Scaffold this active site. Structure first.
Site, PDB file in Angstrom:
ATOM      1  N   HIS A  61       0.821  -1.222   0.000  1.00  0.00           N
ATOM      2  CA  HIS A  61       0.000   0.000   0.000  1.00  0.00           C
ATOM      3  C   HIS A  61       0.848   1.263   0.000  1.00  0.00           C
ATOM      4  O   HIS A  61       0.424   2.304  -0.494  1.00  0.00           O
ATOM      5  CB  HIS A  61      -0.907   0.005   1.203  1.00  0.00           C
ATOM      6  CG  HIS A  61      -1.785  -1.206   1.278  1.00  0.00           C
ATOM      7  ND1 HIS A  61      -1.616  -2.191   2.228  1.00  0.00           N
ATOM      8  CD2 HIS A  61      -2.816  -1.605   0.497  1.00  0.00           C
ATOM      9  CE1 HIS A  61      -2.517  -3.141   2.038  1.00  0.00           C
ATOM     10  NE2 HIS A  61      -3.262  -2.807   0.998  1.00  0.00           N
ATOM     11  N   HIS A  91       5.775   6.785   6.639  1.00  0.00           N
ATOM     12  CA  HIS A  91       5.442   6.341   5.299  1.00  0.00           C
ATOM     13  C   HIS A  91       4.922   7.539   4.533  1.00  0.00           C
ATOM     14  O   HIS A  91       4.771   8.623   5.086  1.00  0.00           O
ATOM     15  CB  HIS A  91       4.376   5.238   5.307  1.00  0.00           C
ATOM     16  CG  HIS A  91       3.075   5.690   5.904  1.00  0.00           C
ATOM     17  ND1 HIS A  91       2.800   5.596   7.259  1.00  0.00           N
ATOM     18  CD2 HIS A  91       2.003   6.291   5.346  1.00  0.00           C
ATOM     19  CE1 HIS A  91       1.617   6.144   7.502  1.00  0.00           C
ATOM     20  NE2 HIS A  91       1.114   6.576   6.359  1.00  0.00           N
ATOM     21  N   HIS A  93       2.277   9.010   1.131  1.00  0.00           N
ATOM     22  CA  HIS A  93       1.215   8.894   0.154  1.00  0.00           C
ATOM     23  C   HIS A  93       1.566   9.810  -1.005  1.00  0.00           C
ATOM     24  O   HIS A  93       2.037  10.920  -0.788  1.00  0.00           O
ATOM     25  CB  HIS A  93      -0.130   9.316   0.753  1.00  0.00           C
ATOM     26  CG  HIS A  93      -0.509   8.562   1.989  1.00  0.00           C
ATOM     27  ND1 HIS A  93      -1.342   7.464   1.971  1.00  0.00           N
ATOM     28  CD2 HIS A  93      -0.134   8.732   3.275  1.00  0.00           C
ATOM     29  CE1 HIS A  93      -1.470   7.000   3.202  1.00  0.00           C
ATOM     30  NE2 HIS A  93      -0.727   7.743   4.010  1.00  0.00           N
ATOM     31  N   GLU A 103      -3.089  13.643   1.082  1.00  0.00           N
ATOM     32  CA  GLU A 103      -4.358  13.243   1.647  1.00  0.00           C
ATOM     33  C   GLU A 103      -5.081  14.471   2.175  1.00  0.00           C
ATOM     34  O   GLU A 103      -6.206  14.740   1.773  1.00  0.00           O
ATOM     35  CB  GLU A 103      -4.119  12.213   2.745  1.00  0.00           C
ATOM     36  CG  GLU A 103      -3.455  10.951   2.174  1.00  0.00           C
ATOM     37  CD  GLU A 103      -3.821   9.693   2.927  1.00  0.00           C
ATOM     38  OE1 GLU A 103      -3.464   9.572   4.115  1.00  0.00           O
ATOM     39  OE2 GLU A 103      -4.460   8.798   2.334  1.00  0.00           O
ATOM     40  N   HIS A 116       3.737  10.906   6.607  1.00  0.00           N
ATOM     41  CA  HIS A 116       3.123  10.628   7.906  1.00  0.00           C
ATOM     42  C   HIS A 116       4.123   9.999   8.845  1.00  0.00           C
ATOM     43  O   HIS A 116       4.635   8.904   8.572  1.00  0.00           O
ATOM     44  CB  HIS A 116       1.929   9.697   7.734  1.00  0.00           C
ATOM     45  CG  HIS A 116       0.782  10.342   7.039  1.00  0.00           C
ATOM     46  ND1 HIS A 116      -0.217   9.624   6.393  1.00  0.00           N
ATOM     47  CD2 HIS A 116       0.490  11.648   6.864  1.00  0.00           C
ATOM     48  CE1 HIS A 116      -1.092  10.484   5.903  1.00  0.00           C
ATOM     49  NE2 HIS A 116      -0.673  11.710   6.149  1.00  0.00           N
ATOM     50  N   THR A 195      -6.084   6.874   7.924  1.00  0.00           N
ATOM     51  CA  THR A 195      -6.574   7.105   6.563  1.00  0.00           C
ATOM     52  C   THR A 195      -6.584   5.827   5.709  1.00  0.00           C
ATOM     53  O   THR A 195      -6.933   5.882   4.528  1.00  0.00           O
ATOM     54  CB  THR A 195      -5.753   8.174   5.823  1.00  0.00           C
ATOM     55  OG1 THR A 195      -4.433   7.685   5.612  1.00  0.00           O
ATOM     56  CG2 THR A 195      -5.722   9.496   6.599  1.00  0.00           C
ATOM     57  N   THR A 196      -6.147   4.706   6.287  1.00  0.00           N
ATOM     58  CA  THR A 196      -6.303   3.393   5.661  1.00  0.00           C
ATOM     59  C   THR A 196      -7.104   2.509   6.606  1.00  0.00           C
ATOM     60  O   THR A 196      -7.166   2.746   7.818  1.00  0.00           O
ATOM     61  CB  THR A 196      -4.955   2.715   5.431  1.00  0.00           C
ATOM     62  OG1 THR A 196      -4.323   2.473   6.691  1.00  0.00           O
ATOM     63  CG2 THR A 196      -4.055   3.585   4.576  1.00  0.00           C
TER      64      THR A 196
HETATM   65  C1  ETS Z   1      -1.546  -0.171   6.003  1.00  0.00           C
HETATM   66  C2  ETS Z   1      -2.090   0.001   7.384  1.00  0.00           C
HETATM   67  N1  ETS Z   1      -1.691   1.202   8.051  1.00  0.00           N
HETATM   68  C3  ETS Z   1      -2.471   1.581   9.208  1.00  0.00           C
HETATM   69  C4  ETS Z   1      -2.385   0.662  10.412  1.00  0.00           C
HETATM   70  C5  ETS Z   1      -1.064   0.696  11.117  1.00  0.00           C
HETATM   71  C6  ETS Z   1      -0.029   0.302  10.125  1.00  0.00           C
HETATM   72  S1  ETS Z   1      -0.626   2.280  11.763  1.00  0.00           S
HETATM   73  O1  ETS Z   1       0.807   2.393  11.858  1.00  0.00           O
HETATM   74  O2  ETS Z   1      -1.371   2.497  12.996  1.00  0.00           O
HETATM   75  C7  ETS Z   1      -1.216   3.392  10.572  1.00  0.00           C
HETATM   76  S2  ETS Z   1      -0.931   5.001  10.548  1.00  0.00           S
HETATM   77  C8  ETS Z   1      -1.864   5.234   9.137  1.00  0.00           C
HETATM   78  S3  ETS Z   1      -2.070   6.876   8.532  1.00  0.00           S
HETATM   79  N2  ETS Z   1      -2.115   6.841   6.938  1.00  0.00           N
HETATM   80  O3  ETS Z   1      -3.342   7.325   9.049  1.00  0.00           O
HETATM   81  O4  ETS Z   1      -0.918   7.618   9.082  1.00  0.00           O
HETATM   82  C9  ETS Z   1      -2.454   3.997   8.635  1.00  0.00           C
HETATM   83  C10 ETS Z   1      -1.992   2.979   9.542  1.00  0.00           C
HETATM   84 ZN    ZN Z   2      -0.543   7.675   6.035  1.00  0.00          ZN
END
Ligand code: ETS
Ligand code: ZN
Length: 257
Positions: A61, A91, A93, A103, A116, A195-196
């Site tokens: 992703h 990570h 986007h 985003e 992020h 956001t995922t």
């Molecule tokens: C692919 C799943 N990612 C999810 C679950 C965990 C990996 S996490 O680290 O709590 C996290 S942080 C974000 S974001 N985009 O809101 O910053 C998405 C996620």
């Molecule tokens: Zn993110």
């Protein structure tokens, strides 16, 4: 199963994760004229001097860099937060074109990408418990615009060819996340969600006003990653962003005037 394609993208997520239609979903558009300056907000305290990065991985992703969060080595405090939040991972986007990819938006303006930095509240003991709490996570969001190169990002860009496909990882030690921050730490903040999937409503969002600049050659490398695993049909990893969601009963606060 979920992703960012026509048949499994954000418009479909509610079927598996009904909280997608919830009251505190992210991202949102930041309307700068409606945000409220709040003089009670404190400056952010970012303490990353002792950060220990571990691995970089393509999770199908996005790509993420993970940190040792077994002690208070890299922490975020202050701002709108109570208590101490430990850095877990960062990570990005990004988009297929320079005019989309973030985003969050600012007065409907989209940036080329969004970084992020994900932190979790130590009072909950582990990240799995934190995601079940309304103040469990704090995510620092930083916009990327295309212009001059960001020297601190180049080490990340140079290893991406080794994690091209889903499930690939590599050792990524001694990376200093301070090289990704803008000069100013002025910010907007609001209560929101991941956001995922699983889209949990556990995040205090801290979005920095000042974008960082990256070069066209740097972002181009992001766009060469693959959503697919090795030996599957090639699908470029682009446009891995969720569109803005309704603000509903929330106010965005600004740390600055
Ligand atoms: C692919 C799943 N990612 C999810 C679950 C965990 C990996 S996490 O680290 O709590 C996290 S942080 C974000 S974001 N985009 O809101 O910053 C998405 C996620
Ligand atoms: Zn993110």
């Amino acid at each position: 199963h979920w992703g960012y394609g026509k048949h499994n993208g954000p418009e479909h997520w509610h079927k598996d994760f009904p909280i997608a239609k919830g009251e505190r979903q992210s991202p949102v558009d930041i309307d700068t004229h409606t945000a409220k300056y709040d003089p009670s907000l404190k400056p952010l305290s970012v303490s990353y001097d002792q950060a220990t990065s571990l691995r970089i991985l393509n999770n199908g992703h996005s790509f993420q860099v993970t940190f040792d969060d077994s002690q208070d080595k890299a922490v975020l405090k202050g701002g709108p937060l109570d208590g101490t939040y430990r850095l877990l991972q960062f990570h990005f986007h990004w988009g297929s074109l320079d005019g989309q990819g973030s985003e969050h938006t600012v007065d409907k303006k989209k940036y080329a990408a969004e970084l992020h930095l994900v932190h979790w509240n130590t009072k909950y003991g582990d990240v799995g418990k934190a995601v079940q709490q309304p103040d469990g996570l704090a995510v620092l969001g930083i916009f990327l615009k295309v212009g001059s190169a960001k020297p601190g990002l180049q080490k990340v860009v140079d290893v991406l060819d080794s994690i091209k496909t889903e499930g690939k990882s590599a050792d990524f030690t001694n990376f200093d996340p301070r090289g990704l921050l803008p000069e100013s730490l002025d910010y907007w903040t609001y209560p929101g969600s991941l956001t995922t999937p699983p889209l949990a409503e556990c995040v205090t969002w801290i979005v920095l006003k000042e974008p960082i600049s990256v070069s066209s050659e740097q972002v181009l490398k992001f766009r060469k990653l693959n959503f697919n695993g090795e030996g599957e049909p090639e699908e470029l990893m682009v446009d891995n962003w969720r569109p803005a969601q309704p603000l509903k009963n929330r106010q965005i606060k600004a740390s600055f005037k």
